[PDB]
Structure formats: C-alpha cells, structure tokens
C-alpha cells in the first residue's frame, strides 16, 4: 500500500480579534495551517489593514537603505543566530521610528 | 602563485589524472595475454613463442607511473600553496 | 540590522495573514473557513494554548470541524533522503487528493534504468565520488553561496546522483564494461585447445586465413558459460555486436514489459481505495488481459529460445527473434517449420 | 563452468535479502520506503543478472579470431 | 558469387544515414536555439527549464550513428549484395525520417518556447509533443533495424 | 535462375515508404503542436482536451510500420521479381498517401485549433473533420494490404 | 577485376571531405562575427568574451583537414575499387554532415548573441548549446574516421 495524501479537513475557527494577535504568531510558528481569502470580492484598500502595509513598506525602505549604507562602509554583519525572535508587539512601531 | 582558484581546479584534475594513471599502469603491468592489439609490430614477436611482449606493457606502465609522479609533484606544490593560504 | 529584519518581515507576514480573514458586520471576532491537518491537531491546540498563555485572556479559540464539496490540499511527508526525488515527481505537476504516491518505486526504477542505459563501471564510480564529496560537504555547501546555478541544481538532487552512480557501478559490473573493457575474472570460458591441431584445419596461418570461425559441434571449445555477466572473450572479437544485437534488445523489452505491467497494476489499488469497481470491471480486467495476450507469449518465446535448442539444430532452428514476427502473418509457412513445441501453431 | 551453481547461489542471496532483510530492518519513520528500496533493488538485480546469464546458454553462432591471437593463445594457454 | 560493384550501395546507405541525421539535428538545434535565445531574455529564471529539445535533438544523431556503425560493421564487397541494398535503403530512409523528426522538433520547440513567458505553466503540455516526435524518430530506427536483420 | 539482384526493389520500397510516413507525421506535429502553443493563453483549462493529433499521427506511423514489416517478412533474396517491384510501388504509394494525410491533417488541425479557443462548443465538430481525414489516410493502408503479396 | 583510375574515388573523397566542410565553416565565420561586431558597438566590455564561438568554425575546418589528410595517407591504386569508394562515401558523408552542423552553429551563435544583447545570464547556456552542436558534429566524425581506418 503506497502512501497517499495525508488527511486534511475544513475548519470553522471562531476567535476574538484581541487574541488573534497571539494566535496568528503561534500558527505562523507552527507552519501547518493554510488560510484563504474569505473576502475574495473585496478591494485591497477596504480591508482596513492596508495603511499598516504602507507603514511596513516605509520601515522596509529605511531598513534596506541602512543595509545599503552598511554595504557602503564595508562592515561585516554578525549573523550570530536568534532565528526565532518572533513577537507580535505594538510598541515596535515607535522603536523603528 | 599558480592562480589559486585554477590551482584548486588543478588539484582536482591532477589527482584524477594520478589515480587514472596508476590504475592504467597497474592494468598494463598485469598484461594477462589480453591487449596484444596495442603492440606495434609485424612478424617480429609473432615468432618463437611469447617473447618481448610483456616488456612493452611494463614500460608503458612505468611511463604512466612517471606521469603520475610529475602530476603528484604538482599536487604537492599545490598542497604547499594550500598551506600558504 | 539582521534581527531587525527578521522581526519586521515576520511581522509583515503576520499582518498579511490577518488581511486574509473575514470581518463580521458588528461582531469583534473573525470567523475563518480554513484547512487543518487531523493527525497533529493536538499540537495545533497546544499552540492555541501557547497563544492564550502569551496574553492571558481565556479566549477558547474554538475550531469546529466540517466537510463539504471543498477540494482539500495535497501533502505527503518527505525528508532529506527523499525530497529531491519527490521534486522530480512534482516537476510534472501533482495528482489528485488521496492518490497513491509511486515515488519510492521511481527512486529505484530511475537509478536502475539510468544505469542500464549508462553501462560504465568507472564513470559510475566518478559520479558517486562527486556525490560523496557533496554528501560529506553538505553543510559547507549549504552555508556557501551557489554562485553557479549548475552546481546548485546538481546539489538539489545530490542523493539522486549518488544512487544513480551506485546503480551505474553495478550495471557496469554486469555488462563487464569498465572503461570499455571486460575483465578476465574467471577463465576464457571457451578454451580453444584444438584450433589447428584437432580443429580439422591446417597451418595456413600468419600469411592468409587469418580470421577463422569455430563450430560448437566439436566440444572442447566451450568451457561453459561465463560465471558472472558477459563473457570477457568477446573483448577480442567483433561478432559480439551481432550477439549483443540478439541479446540486449530482448533484455530491454523484457524489462520494459515488466515495469509497464507493474504500472498498470497500481491502478487497481487506486480503485480499491476509492471503491470504484466500475473502472475495474470494465477497466482494469480487459486492460490486463490485452497486455498479457500481447506480451506474455513473447516473453515466454524469448525465455524458451534462450535454453531450448543447442548448436546441433542451427541450420533448421528458428531465427533469433523473427519467428515471433512470423506469428502475425496469419498464415503459416510450410518451409522450415521451426517451432518451440508440437502444435504450437 | 557450472550450469546453475552460481545461479542458485545468487538467487539464494537475493531471496534472503528479499524475505529476511526487511523484517530485520527496524520499523523506523521511513520503514516502508527502506523496505521497498531493498526489495526492488534485489529483484531488479536478480532479473538483470538472470537475463544476462540465460542469454549465454546454447552458444549457437560461431565466434571469430585472427591468426595472431590463435598463435598467442597457443603460446599462452 | 561476390563480383565487383558489390557494396557501393551499403556505403551510400551509411553515408546518407549519418548525413541526414546531421541535417535533421542541425535544423532542430538551429530552430530550438533561436527560440530559446529569444525567449530566455524575457524569463532568465527559466533558462535551464527551457533547454528540453537540445538533448532531445541529440537523439537524431544518436539514431543515425548507431545505424551507421552497424552498417560499417556489416560492410564488405565480398557480400552477396543481398545485404548492400538493405543497407542503402535502410540508411537513406532512417536518415530522412530523422530529418523529418528534426524538422518537426525544431519548429514545435520554437513555438512552445515562444509560448513560455506569458504562461510558464504548460511545461508538460509542450514536452508531450516533443516526446511524440522523439517516438517517430525511434520508429524510424526500429524499421532500420528490421531491415538490418534481413 | 532469377535475374540477378532481385532483392533490390522491395527493400527500397519499404524504406521510401517509411520516409514518406515520417514526413507526414512530422508535418502533422509541425502544424498541430505550434497551433496548440499559440492557443495556450486563450483557454488554459482546455489544453489537454484539445491535443488529439499527437496520437493521431502515430496512426500513420503505424501504417508505415505495418506495410514495412509485412514487406520485409515477404522478402527473399532470389525473389521471383514479380513481388519485389510490387513492394517498391506499394511502399512508395502508401508512403506518399500518408504524407498527403499528414499534410491535410496538419492544415485543417491548425485551422480548427485556431477557431476553437474563443468558442470550444465546436470541438467535437472539428474532430468530425480531423479524424475523417485520418480515415482518408486509412484508405492508403487498405490498398497497401490488397497488393502486399500476390 | 581492378580497372585503372583506381584511386580516383578516394581522390574525390578527400576533395569532398574538404569542400562542404569549408562551406559550413565559411558560413559560421560569416555569421557569428557580424552579430559580435554589433555587440562590440553596443556592449564593448564583452569583446574578449565572444571569441570561442567564433573559432568554433575553425574546428570544423580542422575536421575536414584531418579527414582529407587521412585519405591522403591512405592513397593507393592496389585496391579493386572497394575501399576507394568507401573513402569517397566517407568524404561525402563528412562534407554534408559538417556543412549542416556549421549552418546550425552559425544560426545558434548569432541568436545567442542577439539574446545576450542585453542580459549577461544567457552567455554560458548559449555556449553550452553551441558545444552540443559541436558534439553532434563529432558523431559523424567518428563514423568518418571509422571509414578512413579502413
């Protein structure tokens, strides 16, 4: 008997949005759940998170520009480790500011 | 010297050459009544029985060994350059 | 800067995940319609407990279970020793949900056939040596940049090359083809003693009558078959090409017939899982019957021709293969009736 | 050479690795993959070697060799 | 028995087989190389994905060469001429069927690669036809061998 | 007794027949595969449904084979020479009719495939003409069989 | 059994072994350098780079060189018109195969230069396809050197 596709199933996940900040980080760490676009027929900019996407784009502009500056100075980067440093905070906006 | 990147390429290529060389020389030294097709003679050694036959394979094996020794001298200097860098 | 990057980017991914949701009109919760593996659900709810622990709020995060017309995703676990082969399978797309995965059979049938094709002992050794270097520097290559994409794609299937090389070594052993040459591991297996003394032949040698043919009717010229693989006496002969023409094609068609029939056989197990005897009763059965009636008789013909008839029937005996074709004539020739047995017509 | 001594030896090897090996293998996470690998390798090995050997039974057509090799195998065998 | 002017025809067969296999492969490689060299600039991440029909085109020369060396082995003016004509016909025709297959392979490979950037999804859907043409070239080899046995 | 070199005819017969067959199949491949690559974008959910000819040209390949094999089986060295010129003519004829079938099938297959994507309704209606042209090809194998030997 | 004029078949064999191979070599020399000169105008930094494709045509010139030289070394009138036309067929065989190879190589080289007119990624892969074509030439060469070793 050859191995077949492992058993997956549908799910109705009710969850209060406050705890969603924890749950999404946890589920990302797990790497075993697949979501979908439950609002397929909705604009990009009506989902009420797009402006946060603009914020993270601004963040990434600044981050990539400073990495380019580090390339200008020719300074090797540590890269010690700390791969699972994955919080879900709010104050981090100010620290990136 | 020796162009380090191409020097490591040469390390690999020359080690392969040395191994193939010693192997070919070994099968030449075997010369077990097999490779009569690789002896350039006409009505010279076909007489008297099997005379002056295995010698040519033995000399070819020695030539292979000498070629391997030269490539191994190059590989030794490549080891020296590896230790240099 | 690097930890800043990892934090920011995983934050980006988190927010994108939130973007894929369903905001209720008034209810502050989000209702999802998502997938989930069944076997690891304990670890999933454990991660939900981790999430509740991170911010104590006593939010149960209830996940009900259902099943509808939705087609689910497809997964089958791989590991470091088999992932590249699954990648080869996935180069051609992916099959339906709950289809049998024939990957391990391919893991064996690809090195084996590639080796049968690639009948070289030494080159198999060299390819396996490349793979061994790569295996012993796995981590060092992972850390190193694959500035050359060719080395990258060679490394992505490293174990594949290793296994291919192993089987290539073995088929080179059987073919007695190590750098184009056959080894005299055992005797010549023919041992022609009476060649011109009791060979019914004179001494017209050297000058004239150079290349001469034997005849098995007189023994002493056949010291048995070679114990292992091809006879190394063919290394100093040229009609080996004719003999190998007779042999290798028959060998290949046998191998292909067997693998093909195995491939057809696996469909029945697909249907026994799906409980579809309609595609078996009118499907599998006539299929296998047709392939059998086509092929089994040929296979038996070859197996019988190998060991049925000796040198003392050659001038009347069946052709090497052509009589199998003479079957299709649908009318049997009364000249030179060389059959495998009585009434075989 | 023996008609079927090496044949029986090799078949015993392949049978032993095909019915006794896999049950001896620990039932690891990749139990089925490893068992199938071993068995498939053994059977394909067996078929290939068997076909090769069965070809060389009943030598029918005549080999050829030049007079020089004739003299030398007279001198070397 | 075996007079002069015996195996002219087999020599011509070997020459024609190898040559026309070279013609088919030359045309196929030309068209496939043109198509890939044009398309790959669009999609530099599919360049090694795009080189299917190169190795497939090699099979044409392989066919012609197997049959050619076979003919050369079975060649002599001391033959009774009831195999030289076989060699002529077989070599000519295997080479020309290889030419047909190489033609089809080249142009269809060019079309399929031209259909890559806009949709890099029909990988299998394009190699199906290339496989089929490879099989045609094989069937040519098969009949060349059928004559070879006679 | 027979005129010397009586094996000359039928062997070129089968060989030229298979050349023409390879040409016919190559042309079918030539037009159909390129057409499919062209219509790739329009209806991507109907690509494998529309790949008929890639097996249909195998049918004419099989015609060429069956004639070639039957002719080769009906061969003898000192043939009467009544049957070998017949093999020459029959092989050439069936091969050329096969090239005709490939030409027509490739043409109309490209024409239909172009007019299919926008409105896949007439898919089977286009099969009506395509496989019909294949039957026109089968007529040739029939006449190859009637005078295969006599 | 052996008329006069015996070596003339091999004479034409050497001459043909040069003729068509030179034709193809000249086509490659004609073709590749033009695109490389345009790419010298547009992308001067790669002037040294695009050199091996150019001398690839000289390699076919050398195949013709070797084949005709072998026939020159094998000239002899003491043949009963057998191995002389064997050399003739070999010379024609090389000539036509090498001409086809040179034409395809020139096409693929120019197409690859046009592809590398912007992206540097293509260079190595296009050179791999070019080397593939060279190997497809080497095939027919080996058949030629089999016939010349007669």
Account of the protein in words:
- This is part of a larger assembly, with 2 copies of chain A, 1 copy of chain B (85 residues), 1 copy of chain D (77 residues) and 3 copies of chain E (150 residues).
- Chain A is built from 3 helices and 1 strand.
- Chain A has 97 residues and is mainly alpha-helical.
- The chains are: A mainly alpha (97), B mainly alpha (85), D mainly alpha (77), E mainly alpha (150).
- At the A-C interface, β1, α1 and α2 of A face α1, β1, α2, β2 and α9 of C.
Structural class of chain D: mainly alpha
Radius of gyration of chain D: 20 Å
User: If you compute it from the alpha carbons, what radius of gyration of chain E comes out, rounded to the nearest whole angstrom?
Assistant: 18 Å
Structural class of chain E: mainly alpha
**From N to C, what is the helix and strand string of chain D?**
HHHEH
Q: How can the largest sheet of chain E be summarized?
A: none
Q: Which protein chains make the most extensive interface, counting residues with beta carbons within 8 Å of the other chain's beta carbons?
A: A-C, 61 and 71 residues
Give me the number of helical elements of chain E: 5
Which strand-content bin applies to the residues of chain D?
A: under 5%
N-end to C-end Cα span of chain D = 17 Å
The total number of structural domains of chain E is 1
- Main beta-sheet strand count, sense and barrel state of chain D: none
Quick one: how many beta strands of chain D? 1
Cα distance spanning the termini of chain E:
19 Å
The share of residues in helices of chain D is over 70%
Q: How would you describe the shape of chain D?
A: elongated
Number of domains of chain D: 1
SS elements, strand count of chain E = 0
- SSE series of chain E: HHHHH
Helix content of chain E: over 70%
PDB class: membrane protein
Keywords: V-ATPase, synaptic vesicle, membrane protein
Entry title: Intact V-ATPase State 2 in synaptophysin knock-out isolated synaptic vesicles
Chains A, C: V-type proton ATPase 116 kDa subunit a 1
């Amino acid at each position: 008997e050859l191995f077949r596709s492992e058993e997956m199933t549908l799910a109705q996940l009710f969850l209060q949005s406050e705890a969603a900040y924890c749950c999404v980080s946890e589920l990302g760490e797990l790497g075993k759940v697949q979501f979908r676009d439950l609002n397929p027929d909705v604009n990009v900019f009506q989902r009420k998170f797009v402006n946060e996407v603009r914020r993270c784009e601004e963040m990434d502009r600044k981050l990539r520009f400073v990495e380019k500056e580090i390339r200008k100075a020719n300074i090797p980067i540590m890269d010690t480790g700390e791969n699972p440093e994955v919080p879900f905070p709010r104050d981090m906006i100010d620290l990136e500011a | 010297c020796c162009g380090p990147k191409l020097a490591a390429c040469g390390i690999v290529l020359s080690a392969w050459g040395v191994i193939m060389l010693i192997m070919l020389g070994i099968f030449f030294n075997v010369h077990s009544a097999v490779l009569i097709e690789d002896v350039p003679f006409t009505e010279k050694d076909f007489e008297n029985g099997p005379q002056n036959i295995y010698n040519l394979y033995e000399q070819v094996s020695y030539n292979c060994f000498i070629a391997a020794g030269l490539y191994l001298l190059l590989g030794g200097f490549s080891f020296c350059q590896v230790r240099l860098n | 800067i690097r930890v800043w990057f990892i934090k920011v980017r995983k934050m980006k991914a988190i927010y994108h995940t939130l973007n894929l949701c369903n905001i209720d009109v008034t209810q502050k919760c989000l209702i999802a319609e998502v997938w989930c593996p069944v076997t690891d659900l304990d670890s999933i709810q454990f991660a939900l407990r981790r999430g509740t622990e991170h911010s104590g709020s006593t939010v149960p995060s209830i996940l009900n279970r259902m099943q509808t017309n939705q087609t689910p995703p497809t997964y089958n676990k791989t590991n470091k020793f088999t992932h590249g082969f699954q990648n080869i399978v996935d180069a051609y797309g992916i099959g339906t949900y709950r289809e049998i995965n024939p990957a391990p059979y391919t893991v064996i049938t690809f090195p084996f056939l590639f080796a049968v094709m690639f009948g070289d002992f030494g080159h198999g050794i060299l390819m396996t040596l490349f793979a061994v270097w790569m295996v012993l520097r796995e981590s060092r290559i992972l850390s190193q940049k694959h500035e050359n994409e060719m080395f990258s794609m060679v490394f992505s299937g490293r174990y594949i090359i290793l296994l291919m090389g192993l089987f290539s070594i073995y088929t080179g052993l059987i073919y007695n083809d190590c750098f184009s040459k056959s080894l005299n591991i055992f005797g010549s297996s023919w041992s022609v003693r009476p060649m011109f003394t009791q060979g019914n032949w004179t001494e017209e040698t050297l000058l004239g009558s150079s290349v001469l043919q034997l005849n098995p009717a007189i023994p002493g010229v056949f010291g048995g078959p070679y114990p292992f693989g091809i006879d190394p006496i063919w290394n100093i002969a040229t009609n080996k090409l004719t003999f190998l023409n007779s042999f290798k094609m028959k060998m290949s068609v046998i191998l292909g017939i067997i693998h093909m029939l195995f491939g057809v056989s696996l469909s029945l197990f697909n249907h026994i899982y799906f409980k579809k005897p309609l595609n078996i009763y009118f499907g599998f059965i006539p299929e296998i019957i047709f392939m059998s009636s086509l092929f089994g008789y040929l296979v038996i013909l070859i197996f019988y021709k190998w060991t049925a008839y000796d040198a003392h029937s050659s001038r009347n005996a069946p052709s090497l293969l052509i009589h199998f074709i003479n079957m299709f004539l649908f009318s049997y020739p009364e000249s030179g009736n060389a059959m495998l047995y009585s009434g075989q017509k | 050479h023996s008609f079927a001594l090496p044949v029986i030896i090799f078949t015993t090897f392949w049978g032993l690795i095909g019915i006794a090996g896999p049950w001896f293998v620990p039932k690891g996470p990749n139990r089925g993959v490893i068992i199938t690998m071993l068995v498939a390798t053994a059977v394909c090995c067996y078929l290939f070697w068997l076909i090769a050997i069965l070809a060389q039974l009943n030598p029918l057509f005549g080999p050829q060799l030049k007079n020089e090799t004739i003299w030398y195998v007279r001198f070397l065998w | 028995n075996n007079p002069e002017y015996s195996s002219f025809f087999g020599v011509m067969g070997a020459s024609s087989a190898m040559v026309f296999s070279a013609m088919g492969a030359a045309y196929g490689t030309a068209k496939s190389g043109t198509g890939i060299a044009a398309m790959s600039v669009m999609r530099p991440e599919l360049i090694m994905k795009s080189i299917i029909p190169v190795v497939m085109a090699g099979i044409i020369a392989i066919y012609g060469l197997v049959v050619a060396v076979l003919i050369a082995n079975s060649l002599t003016d001391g033959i009774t001429l009831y195999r030289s004509f076989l060699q002529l016909g077989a070599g000519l025709s295997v080479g020309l069927s290889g030419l047909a297959a190489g033609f089809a392979i080249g142009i269809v490979g060019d079309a399929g690669v031209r259909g890559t950037a806009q949709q890099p999804r029909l990988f299998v859907g394009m190699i199906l036809i290339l496989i089929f043409a490879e099989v045609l070239g094989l069937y040519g080899l098969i009949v060349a061998l059928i004559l070879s046995t006679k």
